């Protein structure tokens, strides 16, 4: 029969651990680092592009920061293709919610749903889990600015500042060292860049190797704005913060 070739992706180890989840996380650990920092007036998402070339078209590129809603975005760490599958279903779930209640989906509801989908590949079906971890950065009128993180297991949690991908241990200590509850978006933008700058496995931290995004509530308006920085914009903010 076929039983002979079945890896049994959804079983427990004698220690009560899920093999595939553990190995998928191991995979995630080699992915470009992604950082999320939540300030009083906004959220910052910064990620390091894994592997690049002179010929890579950075303008038309995106492999880490994706827009889910107009008020929610995610930073990716892991298999880009796996991420896109989950990102798309996430985008649909946001719209079903809107079409149903005529209100934008509250951040946690969208995050929980996506996490439940992952949890599924963990308990049934015999398929491999998704090799992806997300940092969600969104805003809603019930909890305001929020930062979440979900991984292959299907577990998700909220944070003031957090990282996923490679060198998370190092990045978390650096963040847990200079983060302050009353920070400001611009402060976070800087903290983020510094952290990546110290954890990178590369020579220097140039703009071509980065993706940046901020979700602010532009005072001169009253609504929430998502800004996915363009190459030039990242190059600027890079000089200013003193990384040139």
């Amino acid at each position: 029969g076929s039983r002979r070739y079945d890896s049994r992706t959804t079983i427990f180890s004698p220690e009560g651990r899920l093999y595939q989840v553990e190995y998928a996380l191991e995979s995630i650990s080699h992915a470009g680092t992604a950082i999320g920092i939540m300030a009083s007036d906004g959220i910052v998402l910064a990620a390091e592009r894994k592997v690049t070339s002179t010929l890579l078209e950075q303008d038309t590129s995106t492999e880490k920061l994706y827009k889910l809603n107009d008020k929610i975005a995610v930073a990716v760490a892991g298999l880009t293709a796996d991420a896109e599958i989950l990102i798309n279903t996430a985008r649909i779930h946001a719209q079903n919610y809107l079409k149903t209640y005529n209100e934008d989906i509250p951040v946690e509801i969208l995050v929980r749903r996506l996490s439940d989908i992952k949890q599924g590949y963990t308990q049934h079906g015999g398929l491999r889990p998704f090799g992806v971890s997300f940092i969600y950065a969104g805003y809603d009128d019930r909890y305001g600015y929020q930062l979440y993180t979900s991984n292959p297991s299907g577990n998700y949690t909220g944070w003031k500042a957090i990282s996923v991908g490679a060198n998370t241990s190092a990045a978390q200590t650096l963040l847990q060292m200079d983060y302050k509850d009353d920070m400001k978006v611009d402060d976070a933008i800087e903290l983020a860049l510094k952290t990546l700058s110290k954890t990178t496995d590369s020579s220097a931290l140039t703009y071509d190797r980065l993706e940046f995004a901020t979700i602010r509530k532009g005072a001169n308006d009253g609504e929430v704005y998502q800004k996915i920085f363009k190459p030039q914009e990242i190059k600027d903010i890079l000089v200013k913060t003193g990384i040139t």
Binding site: L25, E26, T60, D82, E84
Partner: protein
């Protein structure tokens, strides 16, 4: 009977690697070289027609295929896999786009569709990843010209120029030297022909090389007249003759 293989054939190893995707990539590495260069007014994709016997008719075997009238593809790796991928790509361009919006899909989205098809063969039950890497070149009104690469994992990336297969490392290096953001289409076609020469062992002419471009609209290739808005396909495969002419200026 009945496919009882409902579990994944691609799983994570203790190291975090997905073996089958790695192995698929290895298959791609053994494949004949193929490349693509983006110019300011067009894109060029090309590859070697590695005929498997002088008795075979290399024309009856196109490595370069049209997906939509403004999008073409070429690959490196397992030919048969590429073929069915082109069939699926041509169809999804209709089912998931033309039949909904009444216009062909922009290059990024079709690439995204193809990538999805490949990602699934990485997680669905009972299958192996596709043993190919594609290079898709196209043009759409709001995005202009673009060039993408889609790997067995389902990951894709946009390029200014790049190469895949056998001597991809060497070719990529040669391209980095000759590329600039002011190249005209003819310039790219030339740069393309030069890069490909380093990868070809034997005969190097318009019969051993297959090359196509995404450039201006070819009203002469439309098949009909009378509708101003319909100007013709931007995708054109160069003829054996058209290639040779450019080889004498090599």
């Amino acid at each position: 009977m009945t496919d009882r293989y409902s579990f994944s054939l691609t799983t994570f190893s203790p190291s975090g690697k997905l073996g089958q995707i790695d192995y698929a990539l290895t298959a791609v590495k053994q494949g004949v070289t193929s490349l693509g260069i983006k110019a300011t007014n067009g894109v060029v994709i090309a590859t070697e027609k590695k005929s498997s016997s002088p008795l075979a008719m290399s024309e009856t075997l196109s490595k370069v295929s049209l997906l939509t009238p403004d999008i073409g593809a070429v690959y490196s790796g397992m030919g048969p896999d590429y073929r069915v991928l082109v069939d699926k790509s041509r169809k999804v361009a209709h089912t998931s786009y033309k039949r909904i919006y009444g216009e062909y899909p922009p290059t990024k989205l079709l690439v995204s569709e193809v990538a999805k098809i490949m990602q699934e063969a990485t997680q669905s039950g009972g299958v192996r990843p596709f043993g190919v890497s594609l290079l898709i070149a196209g043009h759409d009104e709001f995005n202009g010209f673009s060039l993408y690469q889609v790997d067995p994992s389902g990951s894709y990336f946009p390029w200014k120029a790049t190469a895949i297969g056998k001597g991809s490392v060497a070719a990529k290096t040669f391209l980095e030297k000759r590329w600039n953001d002011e190249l005209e289409l003819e310039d790219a076609i030339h740069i393309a022909l030069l890069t490909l020469k380093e990868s070809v062992e034997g005969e190097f002419n318009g019969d051993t090389i297959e090359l196509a471009i995404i450039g201006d609209e070819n009203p002469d290739l439309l098949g009909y007249t009378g509708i101003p808005t319909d100007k013709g396909p931007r995708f054109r495969k160069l003829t054996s003759q058209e290639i040779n002419d450019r080889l004498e200026a090599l």
